[PDB]
Amino acid sequence: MTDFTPETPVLTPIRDHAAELAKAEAGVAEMAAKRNNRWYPKYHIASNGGWINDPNGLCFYKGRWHVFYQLHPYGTQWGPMHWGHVSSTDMLNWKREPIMFAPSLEQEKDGVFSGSAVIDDNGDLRFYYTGHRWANGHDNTGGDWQVQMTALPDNDELTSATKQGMIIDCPTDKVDHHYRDPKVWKTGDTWYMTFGVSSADKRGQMWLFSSKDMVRWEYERVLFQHPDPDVFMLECPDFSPIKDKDGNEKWVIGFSAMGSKPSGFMNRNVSNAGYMIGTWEPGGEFKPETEFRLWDCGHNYYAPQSFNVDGRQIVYGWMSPFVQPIPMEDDGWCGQLTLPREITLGDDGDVVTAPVAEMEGLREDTLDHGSVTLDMDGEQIIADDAEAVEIEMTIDLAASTAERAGLKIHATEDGAYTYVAYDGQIGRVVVDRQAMANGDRGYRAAPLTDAELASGKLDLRVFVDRGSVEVYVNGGHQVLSSYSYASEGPRAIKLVAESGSLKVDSLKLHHMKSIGLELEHHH
């Protein structure tokens, strides 16, 4: 009826969903068949073929972990949006599932955009997602035209769903196009949805709705507007309560912000995700108590989604390749997710995102190097050939006189490498790709607080996969995720000290198992 919030869903089939699924399966299979594994992850989620982006429909349900993701089943760049799907009983051994969604309704005809999953009062899962149309009916040049949809699984395995159609329409004149990425949750006795919006005045907002049956929605208010007028859109919003060190609940608002200008080491990527911590009276505005901070300070990270399982809030991000050249796109796939992280609040009151505990189960072994000291400028080989490894190290900052020091990873015979370092001139942990022979380069620098610098010790937990590095700083107080497209031959890891000494109190290497998604793998 043009009520922005229809009283019952608007279901408008226009394509055979089974046949569209079958065509998507074929597209993925053509790319998987010719895939080059040189940079393909051994222990991160990627499509078996094609481009992926945002994680979606994240849940634990009926005895399995489920990860869905935005998928272009016909090439290795972004294109008509589908949802792909992997599942696991343990977060360690994963299986590929049928493609879940292809566009089949009028309001999503140009893409099945990002969405989430939530378990209702009866223990039944519901999906919420955005349906995308080109505003001009053609291509991106006239902008987006977006609405919110819902669907219900057909089975406990979540291998297929019945779509129910549009539940929240777009009031065209109140929005500047962008209108997407829903999250639904229950607080007290009321169900709430939020999603991202660009206002009529082009400000990034999260809107709030409420529902009693999860299907018919009512507009409540604007939950949050981003204080920087350069920020015009908040994609992939997140909102959840997290227990602080005193046992009090804080609300952590999250989004993937479009429009910020880079400043110093902050907001360096094309778009940038992060958080603020604050308070919320249910039904009211979010009241921030902190300035914006990045979820991840690395080169390649965006669109994180979080979900709750038995009191734990767990988050995946997409490692987003927004900058040319992207050489993995020649290899029949593009895009992986980060490892799953747990969102906690540390003793200093700030968000901490350590890997979930289950990730310890990736370790095949432990090579304990003990304490290592470099007395002056130099290097030591820690590994002659590391395809997929985790390094844990603690550096004694107070004793080490090196100006910069850390690990060169993917250090190949042509002299290329990616450098994970503490840099003492700036008091930050960097990932620096200047010497890489493939992909775009640059560096990214994660902040250390005065207390972290005064502590005298610095912990790094570094996950190297075939095409990527993730650096967890001080137990995931900060994280930097970045692609690292190793050159050919053996891929060394080297401990490095520049212009002074380096005292490493503890250094351990673990080889990483496969999560079973690459299938049979060679060497």
Active site residues: 54
The verdict on 265 binding a second copy (CB under 8 A) reads yes
Taking the least distance from each CB to Cl ion, the nearer of 218 and 488 is: 488
Dihedral through CA 318, CA 319, CA 324, CA 326, nearest 10? -100
- Minimal distance in Å, beta carbon 263 to a second copy? 9
Please give the structure tokens belonging to residue 63.
């005895």
Q: Is 276 annotated as a binding residue?
A: no
**Binding partner selected for residue 128 from Cl ion, a second copy, none, CB under the kind-specific 5 to 8 Å limit:** none
Q: Is 404 annotated as a binding residue?
A: no
Peptide bond before 325: cis, by omega within 30 degrees of 0?
yes
As to burial, measured by CB atoms within 10 angstroms (0-12 exposed, 13-18 middle, 19+ buried), residue 263 is exposed
**Binding partner selected for residue 383 from a second copy, Cl ion, none, CB under the kind-specific 5 to 8 Å limit:** Cl ion
- Minimal distance in Å, beta carbon 381 to a second copy? 14
The verdict on 137 binding a second copy (CB under 8 A) reads no
- Minimal distance in Å, beta carbon 200 to a second copy? 30
- Minimal distance in Å, beta carbon 268 to a second copy? 7
The verdict on 453 binding a second copy (CB under 8 A) reads no
Q: How far apart are CA 487 and CA 305, in angstroms?
A: 32
Q: Is 78 annotated as a binding residue?
A: yes
Q: In 10 A of CB 455, how many CB atoms?
A: 14
Cβ pair 445, 21 in contact under 8 A: no
Q: Is 235 annotated as a binding residue?
A: yes
Cβ pair 199, 170 in contact under 8 A: no
Reading phi first (left if > 0) and then psi (alpha if -120 to 50, else beta), residue 311 is in left
Q: Is 122 annotated as a binding residue?
A: no
Q: How far apart are CA 361 and CA 173, in angstroms?
A: 51
The verdict on 324 binding a second copy (CB under 8 A) reads yes
The verdict on 419 binding a second copy (CB under 8 A) reads yes
Cβ pair 134, 110 in contact under 8 A: yes
The verdict on 490 binding a second copy (CB under 8 A) reads no
Which listed residue (155, 189, 425, 523) binds a second copy by CB under 8 A?
425
Contacts within 8 Å (CB) and 24+ apart, 289-296: 289/250, 290/350, 292/257, 293/350, 293/351, 294/266, 294/267, 295/254, 295/351, 295/353, 295/479, 296/338, 296/353, 296/479, 296/480, 296/481
**Binding partner selected for residue 376 from Cl ion, a second copy, none, CB under the kind-specific 5 to 8 Å limit:** a second copy
The verdict on 498 binding a second copy (CB under 8 A) reads yes
Site for a second copy in 346-405 (CB under 8 A): 376-377, 403-404
Annotation: binding site for beta-D-fructose? 53-54, 78, 81, 114, 180-181, 235
- Contact positions toward a second copy, by CB under 8 A? 262, 264-265, 268, 323-325, 376-377, 403-404, 414-416, 419, 425-426, 432-435, 439-443, 445, 498-500
